[PDB]
Nucleic acid binder design. Structure first.
Ligand SMILES: [K+]
Ligand SMILES: [K+]
Ligand SMILES: [K+]
Ligand SMILES: [K+]
Ligand SMILES: [K+]
Ligand SMILES: [K+]
Ligand SMILES: [K+]
Ligand SMILES: [K+]
Ligand SMILES: [K+]
Ligand SMILES: [K+]
Ligand SMILES: [K+]
Ligand SMILES: [K+]
Ligand SMILES: [K+]
Ligand SMILES: [K+]
Ligand SMILES: [K+]
Ligand SMILES: [K+]
Ligand SMILES: [K+]
Ligand SMILES: [K+]
Ligand SMILES: [K+]
Ligand SMILES: [K+]
Ligand SMILES: [K+]
Ligand SMILES: [K+]
Ligand SMILES: [K+]
Ligand SMILES: [K+]
Ligand SMILES: [K+]
Ligand SMILES: [K+]
Ligand SMILES: [K+]
Ligand SMILES: [K+]
Ligand SMILES: [Mg+2]
Ligand SMILES: [Mg+2]
Ligand SMILES: [Mg+2]
Ligand SMILES: [Mg+2]
Ligand SMILES: [Mg+2]
Ligand SMILES: [Mg+2]
Ligand SMILES: [Mg+2]
Ligand SMILES: [Mg+2]
Ligand SMILES: [Mg+2]
Ligand SMILES: [Mg+2]
Ligand SMILES: [Mg+2]
Ligand SMILES: [Mg+2]
Ligand SMILES: [Mg+2]
Ligand SMILES: [Mg+2]
Ligand SMILES: [Mg+2]
Ligand SMILES: [Mg+2]
Ligand SMILES: [Mg+2]
Ligand SMILES: [Mg+2]
Ligand SMILES: [Mg+2]
Ligand SMILES: [Mg+2]
Ligand SMILES: [Mg+2]
Ligand SMILES: [Mg+2]
Ligand SMILES: [Mg+2]
Ligand SMILES: [Mg+2]
Ligand SMILES: [Mg+2]
Ligand SMILES: [Mg+2]
Ligand SMILES: [Mg+2]
Ligand SMILES: [Mg+2]
Ligand SMILES: [Mg+2]
Ligand SMILES: [Mg+2]
Ligand SMILES: [Mg+2]
Ligand SMILES: [Mg+2]
Ligand SMILES: [Mg+2]
Lengths: 101, 91, 61, 59
RNA sequence: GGAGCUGUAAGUAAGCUAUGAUCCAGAGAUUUCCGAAUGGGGGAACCCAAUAUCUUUUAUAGGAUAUUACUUUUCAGUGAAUACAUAGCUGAUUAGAGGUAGACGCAGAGAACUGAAACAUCUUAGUACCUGCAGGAAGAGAAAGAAAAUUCGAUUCCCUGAGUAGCGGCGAGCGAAACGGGAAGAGCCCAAACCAACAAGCUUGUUGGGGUUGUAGGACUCCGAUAUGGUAGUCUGUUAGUAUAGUUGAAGGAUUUGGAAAAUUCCGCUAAAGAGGGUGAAAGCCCCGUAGACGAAAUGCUGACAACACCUAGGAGGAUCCUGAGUACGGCGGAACACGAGAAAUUCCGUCGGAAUCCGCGGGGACCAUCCCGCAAGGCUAAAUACUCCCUAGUGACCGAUAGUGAACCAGUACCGUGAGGGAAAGGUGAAAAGCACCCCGGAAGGGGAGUGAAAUAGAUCCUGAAACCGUGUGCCUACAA
RNA sequence: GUAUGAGUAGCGAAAGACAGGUGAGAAUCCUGUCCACCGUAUGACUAAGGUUUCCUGGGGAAGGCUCGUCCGCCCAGGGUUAGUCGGGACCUAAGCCGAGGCCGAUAGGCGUAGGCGAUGGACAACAGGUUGAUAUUCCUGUACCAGUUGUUUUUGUUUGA
RNA sequence: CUUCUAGUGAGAAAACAACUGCCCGUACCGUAAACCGACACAGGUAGUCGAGGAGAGUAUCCUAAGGUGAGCGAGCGAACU
């Protein structure tokens, strides 16, 4: 996927539109990604899972990778990504600035 | 086959534990192994002296989960009896 | 098989034609005969057609 | 690993295989009881033996 | 290729990964047992051997590896009746067996129902089935031809000839071919005479050379040439391409509704890319892609170039010699030619008889003569043609879960049958499990709250939810009616 | 798919009773007592066949013609120990296969040598005990059969056991 | 298996001590609810043992060892079968 684990992304569609957060986990096979503080769900857990209350946990659920855009760290804005080889090494590049990653 | 591959694993059950008290140890062995080969394998592996080896074939047992049904793998169970004045096997 | 060792003549299928032209399958056989002949210098009994023998080139040891 | 196996010699490789076979044997026994924790070690040892045999054959 | 990964498949559990994992492509290694199964046996996936080497044991027992089926080719050694020999036997050597793709080809053998309004000739039909051999194609193919415009110049396939000429209880029906127009094109080797060598036992066999035909050729004899062109050869290299992974690849933000925007409205921007798919509803500009550009370590494949290899002679003479024999042909009996014995050619099989040979022979639909055309009884030969089990990429005024494959789902499964064989049913929660924590009734099941959700009458028998059928509530009617 | 018949036919030879227990729940499960049935069997062994139905611990959805706390059902673990038993490393009958071979449109049919093939022939172990489940298999006791090594004792070494 | 020689032969025999002896089946039902009959089916299923009294008897009746009370019941006590 064009996005990676640990990247800073902005949500461009969905209820959490315009939020930003770090990619906690990436699932290329599903083409999905989890962004901290994004797409949070209340899950009714039985106390069987070593939590001696079960309770209603809050956790982020994955969203499709196409619904987020990588935040250009230099500028703080979301941008599309091109691929340019630098010093013989291929890396991502912000199309809006040319900054790397 | 290789002597180390002849013996697969021990068998731990109530019957096997009673056998241990009698100084007889139960193993699962390669299904193609004969009790003479098992005797050789046990001696080399454990440094014990084997008095006798009794051997059985355990038939594949039918099982099922949900919509799927099949059989557990066939097994070959050997009860190895050590001579007196022979070191014990330790597990 | 029952085949002329030299000309290859072999049983085939023919027809019977009555005066009413009724057709029924039959077997047409070559006139084979057991003959002791020299193959590679060693005599042997093989099937041979009378036609193959007619020329006389086929040995008759 | 494969580099080490290639570095070793014929007798060293055979002896290493025997040690690995005994280790795999002991691992099976410990798994049959509850005394085995690093279960992945079983597959690691099996693949080590496979690498050793592959190198031996291609010598 | 660059960040996750240890399948379906959740869950723990334990781990791997920038020292580049998982994953993708090329190459290689390992590849139990049965199975042609092949050491022997056998009720498949099992049992039991011999030989040799090694191995465990003080030693027997045990274990491991290699070889050992049958027949065919060739060689060698042995070796009977029998003397020579041969047969047999042993060893080695060699290449076969079996399976497919329910397709296509050729061949052997070869139906009936059916049609004829019955039925036997005839038709279905040389079809179905069985069997053998195959090849990627097969078959055919280099005139003993087609013709008679005077000519054409191997074969195959297509259009046409034509439902014509014909065949036919002259019924039902069967049914050409040549010319013409096209696809594709390609021609070549022996036998024989003769020469040389060799072995036997002057010819007669092996090898080599020589020769390959019809306006006759060849040998043979003279000459003159030792070139000129070519190939349907090679696991021979060089080079290019291509197949099998991939890289890159433009352009959008707001506002309204909404759970959610791709929808609405306002402004934009891209286009060698407005094909398509996905994304919380319908996206040229969010994602995968597309247009376009680029990429191969390795292994194939194709095409060239080279090398090697192999074919490749002109003229003039005929005195003699050669030019495919139990063959052609004929009688008889069958069969194939559209042609059913018919006036019947032509082709083929079985049986019997049986030629000529260049002043020769065959054909021109009985047959003869004349004329014309050709040269059988030897072989090979690419392309045009037929088919698709598979692989790649696509298409559809094709199906959309009783449809479409029997099979969208663990289907040739469950199930049925002794067996061959027959053969199903069965797709859809939601955008996302967020799959209803907790509380109450109940033993549970199942419910009622409380929650998740836009929606729970979307609660897993889960989208929609028809009719039959069952039930609850009731506005009106009904216990003298056929 | 659902009706009608219809809450109808049927619930598949026969004796059960009560007390106690278990349990949410008992005519149907457990224990006890009496009663009754079979007894050349309805008992005890086995071959075939079945193929885990065996034992233990759980369960009451479905199956059980009612019920079910129970089961030959479901769930989870577990259980079959051989030199002597039966079979193979022994023999063969019928029948079958069949090197070469004979015959035959193809395919193949038949068949010698040689093999396979029991239902037969041959062949060394019994008594007791033990587990929840195996026992001529495990254990105790006492044996037998084939063979290996070693000690000792005797004899034979090529007119040679 | 027993014998005969043919062949083969330097080792033999005995006692004693120790030691070796492979593969397959072994559970359970088995005149049945577990096999063949679609069924927890009044049918069928080879062989062995198969006790007592009376009795020729394995007949017959009642019993031993041993097994079983039959997988819908409770009432009523009409027709009819
Ligand atoms: K076989
Ligand atoms: K096909
Ligand atoms: K007919
Ligand atoms: K008719
Ligand atoms: K051809
Ligand atoms: K026509
Ligand atoms: K007619
Ligand atoms: K030539
Ligand atoms: K999107
Ligand atoms: K789109
Ligand atoms: K290449
Ligand atoms: K004719
Ligand atoms: K002609
Ligand atoms: K002609
Ligand atoms: K709904
Ligand atoms: K109503
Ligand atoms: K009904
Ligand atoms: K009804
Ligand atoms: K129970
Ligand atoms: K035995
Ligand atoms: K017997
Ligand atoms: K004797
Ligand atoms: K047993
Ligand atoms: K009496
Ligand atoms: K009696
Ligand atoms: K009952
Ligand atoms: K009554
Ligand atoms: K009555
Ligand atoms: Mg056993
Ligand atoms: Mg075999
Ligand atoms: Mg008719
Ligand atoms: Mg081929
Ligand atoms: Mg001419
Ligand atoms: Mg792009
Ligand atoms: Mg727009
Ligand atoms: Mg004809
Ligand atoms: Mg003629
Ligand atoms: Mg003739
Ligand atoms: Mg004419
Ligand atoms: Mg061709
Ligand atoms: Mg539908
Ligand atoms: Mg269908
Ligand atoms: Mg169907
Ligand atoms: Mg609704
Ligand atoms: Mg619905
Ligand atoms: Mg009245
Ligand atoms: Mg009234
Ligand atoms: Mg009624
Ligand atoms: Mg009953
Ligand atoms: Mg009686
Ligand atoms: Mg039980
Ligand atoms: Mg139980
Ligand atoms: Mg019930
Ligand atoms: Mg026996
Ligand atoms: Mg035979
Ligand atoms: Mg034969
Ligand atoms: Mg005996
Ligand atoms: Mg028992
Ligand atoms: Mg038993
Ligand atoms: Mg019964
Ligand atoms: Mg009977």
């Amino acid at each position: 996927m064009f996005v990676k684990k640990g990247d800073k992304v902005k949500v461009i569609t969905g209820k959490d539109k315009n939020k930003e957060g770090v990619v906690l986990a990436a699932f290329p096979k599903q083409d999905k990604v989890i962004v901290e503080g994004v797409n949070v769900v209340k899950k009714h857990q039985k106390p069987n899972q070593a939590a001696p209350q079960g309770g209603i946990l809050e956790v982020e659920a994955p969203i499709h990778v196409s619904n987020v855009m990588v935040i250009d760290p230099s500028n703080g804005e979301a941008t599309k990504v091109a691929f340019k080889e630098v010093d013989g090494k291929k890396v991502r590049v912000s199309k809006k600035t040319g900054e790397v990653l | 086959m290789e002597l180390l591959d002849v013996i697969k694993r021990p068998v731990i059950t109530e019957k096997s534990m009673l056998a241990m008290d009698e100084k007889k140890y139960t193993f699962e062995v390669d299904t193609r192994a004969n009790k003479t080969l098992v005797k050789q394998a046990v001696e080399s592996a454990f440094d014990v002296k084997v008095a006798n080896v009794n051997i059985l074939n355990v038939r594949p047992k039918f099982k099922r989960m949900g919509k799927y049904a099949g059989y557990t793998k066939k097994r070959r169970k050997a009860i190895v009896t050590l001579t007196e004045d022979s070191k014990e096997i330790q597990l | 098989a029952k085949v002329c060792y030299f000309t290859g003549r072999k049983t085939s299928s023919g027809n019977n034609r009555s005066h009413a032209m009724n057709s029924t399958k039959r077997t047409v056989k070559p006139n084979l005969q057991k003959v002791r002949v020299l193959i590679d210098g060693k005599p042997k009994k093989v099937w041979v057609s009378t036609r193959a023998l007619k020329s006389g080139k086929i040995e008759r040891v | 690993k494969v580099k080490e196996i290639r570095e070793l010699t014929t007798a060293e490789m055979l002896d290493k295989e025997k040690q690995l076979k005994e280790e795999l044997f002991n691992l099976r026994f410990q798994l049959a009881t509850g005394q085995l924790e690093n279960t992945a070690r079983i597959k690691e040892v099996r693949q080590s033996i496979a690498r050793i045999k592959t190198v031996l054959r291609e010598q």
